[PDB]
């Protein structure tokens, strides 16, 4: 996933 979109 996108790390800057905190999962």
């Amino acid at each position, epitope marked *: *996933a*996108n*790390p800057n*979109a*905190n*999962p």
Partner: antibody
Framework: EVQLLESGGGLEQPGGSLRLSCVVS????????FNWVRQAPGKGLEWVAI????????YHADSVKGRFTISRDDSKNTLFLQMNNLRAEDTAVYYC??????????????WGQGTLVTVSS | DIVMTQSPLSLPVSPGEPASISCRST??????????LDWYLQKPGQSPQLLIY???NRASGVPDRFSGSGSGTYFTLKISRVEAEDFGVYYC?????????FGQGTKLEIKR
């Protein structure tokens, strides 16, 4: 004011090398992942690579794997893309970008202006 | 890889009329409680601009004409009433799995 300023592009022959640089200002560079995205003239956007804020996790796209290398120097708040063994189809505007940053329940996104790489003999 | 299919590829719309752009994935984009699909608008000679993030959330500064919807593999961006400045090419991109992939882009044209 956040600004992502790209440089290092220009003209190079096939098989040559270029090194792109993206200096990030007004932004906590070390805390975020960064991406490289390129766009061939008239064509669409293509994701190239990602490096996480850790620096140990990084990924490259299949089309450029083994030839391009993404890296970061956190001490200078700068992102790099080392381009070796350049091919004609690498001609594109290259953007550094965080892509989506989603934290404190708000969404933001920052992009550089892009720098043009032309690969031809 | 994951293939993002945008439809249509060209979208002529008169100003004031609604527009609808779809984005299809070959694999579910869900991770946790979010769908990792973003919508971008790129005007000629400019950098891409975030419009909708995580499938249905309007980015800061984007006008209320823009909205996003969908889940799983089917997502839709809608403009209730297009205006002159919304012309350009719209891209979706998934970030649920590397390699990140973009759609082909949808060119929103002026319907004369």
């Amino acid at each position: 004011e956040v600004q992502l300023l790209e440089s290092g592009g220009g003209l190079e022959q096939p098989g040559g090398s270029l090194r792109l640089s993206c200096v990030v200002s007004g932004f906590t560079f070390s805390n975020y992942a960064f991406n490289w995205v390129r766009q061939a003239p008239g064509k669409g956007l293509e994701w190239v690579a990602i490096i996480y804020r850790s620096g140990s996790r990084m990924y490259h796209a299949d089309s450029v794997k083994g030839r391009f290398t993404i890296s970061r120097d956190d001490s200078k708040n700068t992102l790099f893309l080392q381009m070796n063994n350049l091919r004609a189809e690498d001609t594109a505007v290259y953007y550094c970008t965080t892509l989506l940053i989603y934290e404190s329940d708000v969404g933001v996104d920052f992009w550089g202006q892009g720098t043009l790489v032309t690969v031809s003999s | 890889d994951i293939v993002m299919t945008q439809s249509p590829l060209s979208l002529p719309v008169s100003p004031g009329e609604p527009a609808s752009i779809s984005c299809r994935s070959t694999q579910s984009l869900i991770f946790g409680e979010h769908n990792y699909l973003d919508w971008y608008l790129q005007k000629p000679g400019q950098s891409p601009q975030l419009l909708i993030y995580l499938a249905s959330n309007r980015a800061s500064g984007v006008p209320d004409r823009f909205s996003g919807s969908g889940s799983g593999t089917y997502f839709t961006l809608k403009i209730s009433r297009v205006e002159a400045e919304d012309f350009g090419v719209y891209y979706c991109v998934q970030t649920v799995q590397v390699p990140y992939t973009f759609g082909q882009g949808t060119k929103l044209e002026i319907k004369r």
